[PDB]
UniProtKB/Swiss-Prot annotation:
Obligatory cofactor(s): Ca(2+)
Location in the cell: Secreted, Extracellular space
Protein name (record): Serine protease 1
Homology family: Belongs to the peptidase S1 family.
Disulfide bonds: C7-C137, C25-C41, C109-C210, C116-C183, C148-C162, C173-C197
Higher taxonomy: Eukaryota, Metazoa, Chordata, Craniata, Vertebrata
Protein residues bound to substrate: D171, S172, Q174, G175, S177
SUPFAM superfamilies assigned to the protein according to its UniProt record, in alphabetical order: Trypsin-like serine proteases
Amino acid sequence: IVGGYTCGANTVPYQVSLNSGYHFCGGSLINSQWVVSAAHCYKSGIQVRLGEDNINVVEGNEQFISASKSIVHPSYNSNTLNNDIMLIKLKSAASLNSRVASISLPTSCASAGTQCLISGWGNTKSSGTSYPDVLKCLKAPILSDSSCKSAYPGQITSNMFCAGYLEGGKDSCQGDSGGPVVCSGKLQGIVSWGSGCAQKNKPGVYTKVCNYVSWIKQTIASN
Ligand SMILES: [Ca+2]
C-alpha cells in the first residue's frame, strides 16, 4: 500500500496473509472455511495466516491453517488478467472471533464514487521497494468506467474496475495482490494489477467481485 496508513492491529479482521514460507499475497476470509484471493496468486503449498498484524512476530491472535484445495476461476486468463479470482479452502475451519471474521459478498456492483478500504502488506514505495511488517490501509474511491478505461485503453474488461486517485501518490502495490477492496461492508474488489504503483493517471485495477458471486457460492457449496 503506497500513501496509506498503519491500520491498527486486527482492525481488518477478514484480511489474510497467504504464506509459502514467507508472505506473498493477501486474501479475504468469506466464511470459516473459505478464502477468496487473486488467481495470479496461485501456487501449491499455501498456508493461510489469519488474525495477523505484524507478519514477522507471533503476537498471539494468529491462526495458521494449510489449504486443502485451491480453485482458480475456470476462465482465468493470465495474459489479460481477466477473471483474476481464486478460492482457497481451509483444511480446518477458522475459529471466528473479534480478530478473525468473515467479510460479506456484494449483492450488486458498486457505483463510481463509493468509498472503499484497501489493505495489505505490499510495497509502500512508488519508486523503489519497502515492505512493511504491519498491515497498511488505504481509503480510495471507485473510479468511473471512463476514467478507468481511459487510463488503460483496451485492457479493462467488464470483470475489472479501477479505484484510487488519478493524481497518484495513493494506491495498492505488489504484495497487496489478492487482498480486499471493501466498500459499504462488502467485498467489492480483489487487488489485481496496475501500471507501477501510485503513478499519475494509472489507478489500481481490481477484480470485480460482484460478477463472481454466483460462481463463488456454487463452487463453495459443492466443495
Ligand atoms: Ca503475527
